Every structure is written in C-alpha cells, then in structure tokens.
RNA sequence: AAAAUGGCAA
RNA sequence: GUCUCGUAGAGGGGGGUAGAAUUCCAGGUGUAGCGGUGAAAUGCGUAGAGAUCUGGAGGAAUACCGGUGGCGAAGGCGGCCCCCUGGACGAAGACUGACGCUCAGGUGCGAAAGCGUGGGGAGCAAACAGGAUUAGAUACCCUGGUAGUCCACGCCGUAAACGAUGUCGACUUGGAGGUUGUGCGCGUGGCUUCCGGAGCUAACGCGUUAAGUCGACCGCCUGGGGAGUACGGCCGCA
RNA sequence: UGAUUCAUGACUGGGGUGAAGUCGUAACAAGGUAACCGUAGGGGAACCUGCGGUUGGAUCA
C-alpha cells in the first residue's frame, strides 16, 4: 500500500461504455471502475451519469494510496468524456493537467464497412 | 489538446479551455469520420454537394 | 554538377567526431571537383520528437555543388554510419551561400 | 531464363528448363575437383538407410570455399559455373596472389566483379564479414553457425537469411524456414542472396528426368501388403488408419525434434 | 498573406520561427483560409513544414 | 529532354547556321537524338506508359517531317536518313 | 425493433 | 512546327525514408468484467480479460495542408527525399515554310472485379460459421472469418469507362469567382467554377468551355418485347 | 471423302401467351438496407453480399 501523491486518471470513453483507470505516473494501475460495473447496464451504461458514477467508484478504489493530484488523459468520443473529469474534481483530486489522447491515424488501416440500418 | 491548469485557475475555466482546444483540433469530428469506411465515390459526392450548397 | 543541400544529424555522444566527419565529407566533394558553397554546424539541438530514444542531436548543414555520383556515395556513407541518426539530401536550383536562419 | 519446351513428344510437353547463358560451357577447374562415388542410399552395413536413392548421372565434386577466410586479399570473379552437387551455381574466383577458389555464386554476381572477405570488407554482395561487422537488417547467405566452422545456413539456390537483431555476443537471424535463431556475432556471413532463384521454376516433365538426378520411385504404403507397411492391405482401395511412416510413427503433424542441447539458440520455431 | 507582401521566393524549412506561426498547438498545418496565405505559398508552406517534421525541427503531433 | 549543349551541337551540325533551328533536317536530327536517348530509359522502365506516349509523338512527328522532306527535296532526304542512320 | 399482401373492370 | 529563358503541377517509372494508427508477440501494474445492439446474444475474461505502461515484429495507407485546388488522352494520380522521364503554359526574338485537320481497317493505353506463376498478408472482407431479427430471413444488424484487397510479371479488355455531349477550326452581348504566367492600380495570356443575354431546344435546359452560327472528317440510330440473346467466326487459360 | 442447305429426332435450354394457381415482395416514396453499372461469390425465387464506379438518390429542421 505504497502512498502515491501524483497519479494519472485514464478515461476510456466509448459509445457503449466508460472505463476509468487511475494509475501512477509510470502507468502502473492502482484502481479502476467502469460504467458497466457501476450497476448500469444496457442504455444506462452509455450515459454521462454512469460515467460520473464510475469515476467516483474509481476514486473510492484508490483512496488508500492517498493520491492528491491527478493528471487526466481522455480517450474516445463517448458521452462520459466530460462527466468523469468533473466527478474527479468533485472527488477532491486536484487536476493538474487535462489531455486528449484519442488515437488518430495519419492517413492508417481501412476502417470497418458502413452499417446499413 | 494538452491543457495545463494555470495557477489560481478554477477547474471549470480549465475544463472549458480543454473543450475549446478539442473543438479546435476537431478530435471528435475526426473520430466520427474514421468509424466506418467511406468509398472514394461517396467522399467525392459529399464534397461536391457541400460546395454546391455553400454556393 | 548539381546543387544539393545536405542536413545530417549525429548522435550526441559522437558530437566529438563531427569535425572529422565534416572534413572527410567536404574532402570527397572537393576531390570530385565539387564546391562547398555553405557549411554550418548548428551543434546539439533539442529534437522535436525522440529519435532512436534520443532527445537531442548534433545538426550539420552543408550546401554543395557536386557530381550526382559523389552525392550518392555520401548518402551510402550516411546509411552505414551509425553515428548519423538521420540525413536529408535535397536538390537546389542555385547555390546557396547566405547564412541559414 | 525459364523456357517451356514445345510438345513435340509427350515426355517434353510439360518440361520447363532454366537456361543460364552466363554459365561456363567448358570443363571445371581441375585442381578443385574430387571424385564422389554414389551410395545408393546404403550405409556401411550395406543396408538401404535412405530409400529412393540410386543411379543418376556420374558427378565430380567441386571443392567450394564455405569458410571464406582468405581475408584482406581482393578476388575477381573469372566465371560462373554449373555445379551438379548443389542447386546454387558456383563462381571461380581469382585472388590477387594467384590462388583460385570456388564460392557459392550470389544473386547479381558476374564475371569481373571483385569480392573480399574480412572485418574491413565493404558491404557489397559476395563479400564475407563477421556478422558483428554486418549492419542489422542486412540480407546474407552462407552463414556460419560456429565461428570458423564454415557456412551451413542459406546455401541453396535463392536462399538468404535476415539479421533481425544484435544483442551482446549473439545476433538473431530469420531463417528461410521462418525460424528465429541466435548465432554468435563472430560467425561469418556473405552479403546478398544465393543466386539461381529460378531453380524452383523448373518442371522435370517426365519420370526419366527424376531418374537422371538419382531419385528412384516412391511406392505408396497403401499400395503394399500388411507385412510390408502399416498402410498395406485391403480388398480394393482401403485405408482406415492414422497415416504413419513405414516404421509406424504418425506422419501428419507429429513433431520429431528432440534436441535439448540446441534449444537455447532457438528464439522462435518456424510454426 | 505575409509571404506575398514579403516577396519571398520560397518558404524555408529551416526557418522554424516563421513555420511555427502556420502550425497549431497540436502541430497541424493551419488552413490557408484562416491564415489568408495565397495558394502558391500555402503549398510551399506545407512542403517546408513536412521537411521540418522529418528533420525533427517541428513535431508531427503535440503528443510524441 | 535534350540538354542545351546537345541541342546546340545538333543545330550546328545539320543547320545552315546556329540560328537555323527550324530546318526540317535540324528538327529530325533533334527528334532522332531524343528517341535514341530514350531507348535506354524505356529498357529500364518498361511500364512507363505515360512517358512512352511522349516518345511515340516524337516518332510520329519525325515521320511526318521526313515525308515532307522527301516530297520537298529527295536529295536532302536521302542525305539526312544516311547521316542519322534511319531505315526510312 | 418490426411493419407482408390486395384479379380486371369502367 | 523548331530553338532560346522561365513558371506551376497528387503527370509517369524506379529507389529510399519518416511519423501517426491498427493487429500480433513478450513482460510489468491491476481486477471483474469486456465487447456488442434498437434491445440482445454469439464472442472474450479469474488458465487474469478489458484498462494502463515498456520493448519488439509486421503489413498497408499517408491526418492536418486540402480547395467547385492542380496534373494527366482517357483510365487515373495525394507524406517526404533522390534518380530517370512525358506534357502544358508565358515573355521577347530567331528559324522552317502549309510540313495541316480527320481517320474505316490497324495498333497502343485502359477503373474494379477476375485469371496464371511466384511472393506477401497488419487492417478490411465476397464465401463460410455462429448469434440475432422474422411468419420465414439462404438478408439487412452482431461476433468471427477465407479468397481477395498488397508486390513482381503475364492475361483479361469490361464499367452509369458519364458532361449519358466524337475530334479539329472560325464566329457571336455580359457578370461574379478560382488557379497559373506575364507587361506597365491599369492591362495582357493559359486553364477552370457559378450565373445569365441573344439564339437554340419537346421541354428540361445549353448559353464564347454551346446544346448558338458555320466548315472538315469519323462513329452511330431507325417502334417495344424477343436480344446484345441464338448460331457461326475471331479472341481468351477460364 | 468433304462442304453446304433442308427436313426430322428420345430428351433438353431459354422465350412468348393463357385463370382471380403456389411462394414470397425485388423495383417505383428515403419503396422502408437509395437505386443502378461492371465484376465476383452465394442463395427456392425475385435477389443478397464484396470491390470499384455513376446520380438517373430523399432528408437538412
Ligand atoms: K545511419
Ligand atoms: K508412388
Ligand atoms: K491399404
Ligand atoms: K489394397
Ligand atoms: K487386395
Ligand atoms: K490517314
Ligand atoms: K484473410
Ligand atoms: K471518330
Ligand atoms: K440437325
Ligand atoms: K434492394
Ligand atoms: K453487385
Ligand atoms: Mg523419398
Ligand atoms: Mg546445380
Ligand atoms: Mg545430389
Ligand atoms: Mg512423389
Ligand atoms: Mg497388392
Ligand atoms: Mg502391420
Ligand atoms: Mg471397397
Ligand atoms: Mg469405411
Ligand atoms: Mg516533371
Ligand atoms: Mg485536367
Ligand atoms: Mg485488381
Ligand atoms: Mg492473384
Ligand atoms: Mg471483419
Ligand atoms: Mg460482417
Ligand atoms: Mg460498353
Ligand atoms: Mg470515371
Ligand atoms: Mg456511352
Ligand atoms: Mg485523332
Ligand atoms: Mg447557364
Ligand atoms: Mg454474347
Ligand atoms: Mg421492397
Ligand atoms: Mg430498397
Ligand atoms: Mg431508389
Ligand atoms: Mg449475401
């Protein structure tokens, strides 16, 4: 239970789900939570509110480490992009930096075919 | 879009700056564009249609 | 002969070898009847992005007029020299002697 | 060049020849020749130990320099030659000191080309260096497995190895099989690929052409009687058993490598 | 268009200080419509920036 | 394309004067010079179809000039083809 | 989300 | 039509290289979910997934720039660098002296798919498998996934290969733009987008880039089906 | 011994016509998965799917 003052929150915001993983600065995971695991399934899972709850649950999960300052990395276009960050601030972590790490190819691989609905 | 919270800056102000930076970078638009493959014929047709509508 | 602008970057630990490298490269051009129109040593600079896990490199710029064959030989030398992490050879329309930015 | 024969007889219809105009038309260099009499696949007990070997054309052995240890002395390629003992062509090279040797002919090598071996040799096809002195990512052939032993890997026509990495006293090689193998960096290799890559495009065209190469017919196990082979037997075409060798070992997928001594050198099996 | 007013023959990849004006914080080349650069110079600018990126004078992206 | 020096030489050899760049003989000699030079290129680059279209235009242009010259003056035509080593 | 069909007449 | 000088360009062929990303492989941290949909399930995960971090492998494509932008006979062509190479355009002169236009047959080029031989194979994905949906669902949707997509070389010779508009030349009110030269704010060339006048058109529309007014040459049409099919020929490995 | 033309031939291919037959619903509206072109594979059937192409697609508050 080594005390980590400075951590990085990784937010994986997809259209279906939100995954929040808090790591040390080296990138070793300390705790995580998901919208799916936070008691939201189906339509509820892909909501900002569900993402918010996941952030809170992740904050509770890493309470022993006594992290004070969080750098935030946001990935993906999902609805949980901003709600999670607000929740982390509400949890009382000081947000030093906010960065978007969504991957973008410089061309890259052919994407899947268009859905016909 | 890398935002560093300045000293004596409210989180909300910093968050708004992050949102603005993402919009400038057009990260979300790029992601939506790359979700599925657009045939070049489809791409060309869209670009022409946009130009005609603007005119 | 043709005018080429050559920028090569050397591993920072081999920065000491750079003066000897420059003289050898210039010698090859002059030996082939080429002319060194401009030579500048920018020195160690911070890389915009890490190259080969290096955050700095020693930059050398040279503008030269030479036969294409000697330039090809110089490019092979750069390829097989471990010290030279990266190089760029560009044709120029005319000789450049004015100081670089 | 790859040439299809015209169908002037049934035995010629499917023949495809690989014709190299560069190959010397004359006799080989006599001082580097030795006799090599045939075995018929029989060992010193006089028993057949490898089936399907016998007959074929008489062949003289050419002493080929696999070691390439005459360092510091340039050599000029006099001529490329056919060698009946191997798929690759060979090159007769003349050293400046007046010594002649045969080497495996690399792709692109031609009469008049100059080659050299040693630590200080230039990185050019046909030159031989310790792999420590060869750039990573290079294509090489005639690779030694032990320093000074002589090349053992990538000697067949068109073959080559890639030096994928260098770590300490060892290099990692990608073999033609697709295996990743570690070899000592002091081991020598020749730059380039073995020549005669069109070798595999030949089509023998007729039974007799295999006989000329000393290959005797393969009789299928299922065509025999039980006493002769596990697959033997049956009234009509029958099988109904897992395929095996004549000696009863499964012959479709069962692995037979068993060498704990050399396992350390294998980074990744061919798969 | 500064380049038109300046009367520069060719934009230089070595001139990073100029180039930095025409790249965003993310490192993306800025559109000509925003800058007001003439098309001919915009093409020269793009080539210069790409050359500078290769030489590691400029970043391809804000997060290497 | 042909170098300035190479062009200038040809103009002198076949032209009445250096100013005489328009003469049929000069034009044909310039075309022959480029066609012969490009043979090396197309041996190396057999799938360079776009460039070959340019070559074929040179061949066609040369043919039309020779046909003009032959009707205009047979003797000049006979000398030119001999000098340039053309079949016709 | 799913969501088919309907003689030729005048 | 040639020469002289210069300009712009994803024009072509060859070789090299860079950064981003996906997948895979190895390892660290970490723990119960992940993924996916209209909603699900198949699938993946306690044999430690997903997430996160580090190292490695490999293929393919080049974000931004980027544009009713450019280049090309058409098909097409997009990171950067070099090598070889085609065309276009402008300026001011010089030169040749009708050397031109069109073109049956002929010949060459010709997207994608497909075919042959030898390679390659990340991603994607006909076929195929499973899960859904449904009355059924040989589909649409989901999870996977082989040919193929890539490379060399050869074949095929077709596309709503379209501007559904053959090529060349002359002539006939305007307006607003784009792009690329050039002379002295005003000119003068090349190419291109939109709008519109006369005229033309069945109408829609076209409108100096004509579908207007004329000339040269070629290709083609003659009610709908049957049928671009049968038969024969030629071509093709099919 | 060939060529050609005509007649005829078990059976078979596709075409047309005829009952208000049977199975679906592919197209026309965004025809409920825009349609169509070339090509390839698949499927009781109309067709479906891939790749590239066209607009001779609706929508834009
Ligand atoms: K190097
Ligand atoms: K047999
Ligand atoms: K049997
Ligand atoms: K039997
Ligand atoms: K029997
Ligand atoms: K004619
Ligand atoms: K596959
Ligand atoms: K015609
Ligand atoms: K008959
Ligand atoms: K349909
Ligand atoms: K189709
Ligand atoms: Mg055998
Ligand atoms: Mg042999
Ligand atoms: Mg043998
Ligand atoms: Mg056999
Ligand atoms: Mg028997
Ligand atoms: Mg037995
Ligand atoms: Mg039986
Ligand atoms: Mg049985
Ligand atoms: Mg060019
Ligand atoms: Mg054009
Ligand atoms: Mg294809
Ligand atoms: Mg193939
Ligand atoms: Mg798939
Ligand atoms: Mg699928
Ligand atoms: Mg047609
Ligand atoms: Mg087209
Ligand atoms: Mg047509
Ligand atoms: Mg014509
Ligand atoms: Mg109009
Ligand atoms: Mg037909
Ligand atoms: Mg329908
Ligand atoms: Mg439909
Ligand atoms: Mg439709
Ligand atoms: Mg289907």
Curated annotation (Swiss-Prot), chain B:
Family that this chain belongs to: Belongs to the bacterial ribosomal protein bS21 family.
Biological process according to GO: cytoplasmic translation; ribosomal small subunit assembly
Keyword Ribonucleoprotein recorded: yes
GO cellular component, one term: cytosolic small ribosomal subunit
Function: Probbly involved in recognition of ribosome rescue factor SmrB in stalled/collided disomes; fusion of protein fragments to its N-terminus decreases ribosome rescue in the presence of SmrB.
Residue numbers of the full-length protein present here: 2 to 56 of 71
Gene name of the record: rpsU
Keywords assigned by UniProt, alphabetized: Ribonucleoprotein, Ribosomal protein, RNA-binding, rRNA-binding
Biased composition (Basic residues): 45-55
Quaternary structure annotation from Swiss-Prot or TrEMBL: Part of the 30S ribosomal subunit. In stalled ribosomes contacts ribosome rescue factor SmrB.
UniProt signal peptide: none
Recorded superkingdom: Bacteria
Protein name: Small ribosomal subunit protein bS21
One Gene Ontology term of the molecular function aspect: rRNA binding
Keyword RNA-binding in record: yes
Taxonomic placement: Bacteria, Pseudomonadati, Pseudomonadota, Gammaproteobacteria, Enterobacterales
From Swiss-Prot, chain D:
Pfam families found in the cross-reference section: Ribosomal_L2, Ribosomal_L2_C
Record-stated family: Belongs to the universal ribosomal protein uL2 family.
Domain of life from the UniProt record: Bacteria
Note: This protein can be partially replaced in vivo by its H.marismortui (HmaL2) or human (L8, from the 60S cytoplasmic ribosome) homolog.
Subunit-structure text: Part of the 50S ribosomal subunit. Forms a bridge to the 30S subunit in the 70S ribosome, contacting the 16S rRNA. Interacts weakly with S6 in one of the 3.5 A resolved structures. In pull-down experiments interacts with CedA.
Region (Disordered): 27-52, 220-271
GO MF: RNA binding; rRNA binding; structural constituent of ribosome; transferase activity; zinc ion binding
One GO-annotated biological process of the protein: ribosomal large subunit assembly
Biased composition (Low complexity): 38-47
GO cellular component: cytoplasm; cytosol; cytosolic large ribosomal subunit; DnaA-L2 complex
SMART domains on file: Ribosomal_L2, Ribosomal_L2_C
Name under which the protein is recorded: Large ribosomal subunit protein uL2
Function, in words: One of the primary rRNA binding proteins. Located near the base of the L1 stalk, it is probably also mobile. Required for association of the 30S and 50S subunits to form the 70S ribosome, for tRNA binding and peptide bond formation. It has been suggested to have peptidyltransferase activity; this is highly controversial.
Modified residues (N6-acetyllysine): 241
Keywords: Acetylation, Ribonucleoprotein, Ribosomal protein, RNA-binding, rRNA-binding
Swiss-Prot record, chain E:
Cellular component annotations (GO), alphabetically ordered: cytoplasm; cytosol; cytosolic small ribosomal subunit
InterPro entries: Ribosomal_bS18 (IPR001648), Ribosomal_bS18_CS (IPR018275), Ribosomal_bS18_sf (IPR036870)
GO MF annotation: an example: structural constituent of ribosome
Record keywords, A-Z: Acetylation, Ribonucleoprotein, Ribosomal protein, RNA-binding, rRNA-binding
Matching Pfam families: Ribosomal_S18
One record GO biological process: cytoplasmic translation
Family the entry assigns: Belongs to the bacterial ribosomal protein bS18 family.
Function (record text): Binds as a heterodimer with protein bS6 to the central domain of the 16S rRNA, where it helps stabilize the platform of the 30S subunit.
Annotated protein name in UniProt: Small ribosomal subunit protein bS18
UniProtKB/Swiss-Prot annotation, chain F:
Keyword Amino-acid biosynthesis: no
Molecular function via GO: rRNA binding; small ribosomal subunit rRNA binding; structural constituent of ribosome
Record's protein name: Small ribosomal subunit protein uS15
Gene that specifies this protein: rpsO
Function: One of the primary rRNA binding proteins, it binds directly to 16S rRNA where it helps nucleate assembly of the platform of the 30S subunit by binding and bridging several RNA helices of the 16S rRNA. Binds to its own mRNA, stabilizing it 5-UTR and preventing its translation. In the E.coli 70S ribosome it has been modeled to contact the 23S rRNA of the 50S subunit forming part of bridge B4. In the two 3.5 A resolved ribosome structures there are minor differences between side-chain conformations.
UniProt keyword list: Ribonucleoprotein, Ribosomal protein, RNA-binding, rRNA-binding, Translation regulation
Pfam family of the protein (one): Ribosomal_S15
Induction of the gene: Part of the metY operon that extends to pnp, also has its own promoter.
Superkingdom of origin organism: Bacteria
């Amino acid at each position: 239970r080594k005390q980590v003052s400075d951590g990085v929150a990784h937010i994986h915001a997809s259209f279906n789900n939100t995954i929040v993983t808090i790591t040390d600065r080296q990138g070793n995971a300390l705790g995580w939570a998901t919208a799916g695991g936070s008691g939201f399934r189906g339509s509820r899972k892909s909501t900002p509110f569900a993402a918010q709850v996941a952030a809170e649950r992740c904050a509770d999960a890493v309470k022993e480490y006594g992290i004070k300052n969080l750098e935030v990395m946001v990935k993906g276009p999902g609805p949980g992009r901003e709600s999670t960050i607000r929740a982390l601030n509400a949890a009382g972590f000081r947000i030093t930096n906010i960065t978007d790490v969504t991957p973008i190819p410089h061309x890259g691989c052919r994407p899947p075919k268009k859905r016909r609905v | 879009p890398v935002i560093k919270v300045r000293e004596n800056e409210p989180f909300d102000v910093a968050l708004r700056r992050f949102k603005r930076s993402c919009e400038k970078a057009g990260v979300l638009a790029e992601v939506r564009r790359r979700e599925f493959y657009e045939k070049p014929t489809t791409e060309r047709k869209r670009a022409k249609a946009s130009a005609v509508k603007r005119h | 002969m043709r005018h080429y602008e050559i920028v090569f970057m050397v591993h920072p630990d081999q920065s000491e070898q750079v003066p000897g490298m420059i003289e050898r490269y210039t010698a090859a051009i002059t030996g082939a009847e080429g002319k060194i129109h401009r030579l500048e040593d920018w020195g160690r600079r911070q890389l915009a992005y890490p190259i080969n896990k290096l955050h700095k490199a020693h930059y050398v710029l040279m503008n030269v007029e030479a036969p294409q064959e000697v330039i090809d030989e110089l490019e092979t030398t750069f390829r097989f020299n471990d010290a030279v992490i990266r190089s760029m050879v560009m044709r120029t329309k005319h000789a450049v002697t004015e100081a670089s930015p | 060049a790859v040439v299809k024969c015209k169908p002037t007889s049934p035995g010629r219809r499917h023949v495809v020849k690989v014709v190299n105009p560069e190959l010397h038309k004359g006799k080989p260099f006599a001082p580097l020749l030795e006799k090599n009499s045939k075995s018929g696949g029989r060992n010193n007990n006089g028993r057949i130990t490898t089936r399907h070997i016998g007959g074929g054309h008489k062949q003289a052995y050419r002493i080929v320099d696999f070691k390439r240890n005459k360092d510091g002395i340039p050599a000029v390629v006099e001529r490329l030659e056919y060698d009946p003992n191997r798929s690759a062509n060979i090159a007769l090279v003349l050293y400046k000191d007046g010594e002649r040797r045969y080497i495996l002919a690399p792709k692109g090598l031609k009469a008049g080309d100059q080659i050299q071996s040693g630590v200080d040799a230039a990185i050019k096809p046909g030159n031989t260096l310790p792999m420590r002195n060869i750039p990573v990512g290079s294509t090489v052939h005639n690779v030694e497995m032990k320093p000074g032993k002589g090349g053992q890997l990538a000697r067949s026509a068109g073959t080559y190895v890639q030096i994928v990495a260098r770590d300490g006293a060892y290099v990692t090689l990608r073999l033609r099989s697709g295996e990743m193998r570690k070899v000592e960096a002091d081991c020598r290799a020749t730059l380039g690929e073995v020549g005669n890559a069109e070798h595999m495009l030949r089509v023998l065209g007729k039974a007799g052409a295999a006989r000329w190469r000393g290959v005797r017919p393969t009789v299928r196990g299922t065509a025999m009687n039980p006493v002769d082979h596990p697959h033997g037997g049956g009234e009509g075409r029958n099988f109904g058993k897992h395929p095996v060798t004549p000696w009863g070992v499964q012959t479709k997928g069962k692995k037979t490598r068993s060498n704990k001594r050399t396992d350390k050198f294998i980074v990744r099996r061919r798969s | 268009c500064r380049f038109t007013a300046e009367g520069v023959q060719e934009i230089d990849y070595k001139d990073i200080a100029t180039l930095k004006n025409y790249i965003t914080e993310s490192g993306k080349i800025v559109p000509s419509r925003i800058t007001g650069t003439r098309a001919k110079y915009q093409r020269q600018l793009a080539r210069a920036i790409k050359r500078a990126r290769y030489l590691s004078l400029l970043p391809y992206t804000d997060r290497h | 394309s042909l170098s300035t020096e190479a062009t200038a030489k040809i103009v002198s050899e076949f032209g009445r004067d250096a100013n005489d760049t328009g003469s049929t003989e000069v034009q044909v000699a310039l075309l022959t010079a480029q066609i012969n030079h490009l043979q090396g290129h197309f041996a190396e680059h057999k799938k360079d179809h776009h460039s070959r279209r340019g070559l074929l235009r040179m061949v066609s242009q040369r043919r039309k000039l020779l046909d003009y010259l032959k009707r205009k003056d047979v003797a000049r035509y006979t000398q030119l083809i001999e000098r340039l080593g053309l079949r016709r």
